[PDB]
């Protein structure tokens, strides 16, 4: 049960951060300056790591979760 719950959370975070790797939630691709995108709050050291600083991974994810959900639904339609 713990394995399934942790795997669900890890997979969901991995999909979210693989989607917003180059794609920017604010439109276009990321504009990385000083390790941080100017348009959004993405940090370079968070795209591939979701364990070292879990507080920051839960902050960026919470900001653009909805936008993410609508985009995910829209892709899966028509």
């Amino acid at each position: 049960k713990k394995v399934q719950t942790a795997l669900k959370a890890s997979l969901e975070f991995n999909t979210f951060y693989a989607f917003y790797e180059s794609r920017c939630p604010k439109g276009g691709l990321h504009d990385f300056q000083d390790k941080k995108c100017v348009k959004c709050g993405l940090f370079t050291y968070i795209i591939y790591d979701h364990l070292s600083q879990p507080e920051l991974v839960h902050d960026y994810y919470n900001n653009y979760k909805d936008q993410y959900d609508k985009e995910k639904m829209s892709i899966r339609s028509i």
Binding site: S22, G27, G28, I75
Partner: peptide
Amino acid sequence: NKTTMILKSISLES
């Protein structure tokens, strides 16, 4: 095509 505008991450103003 809105799916391509999302998958390619292209804004309308672009």
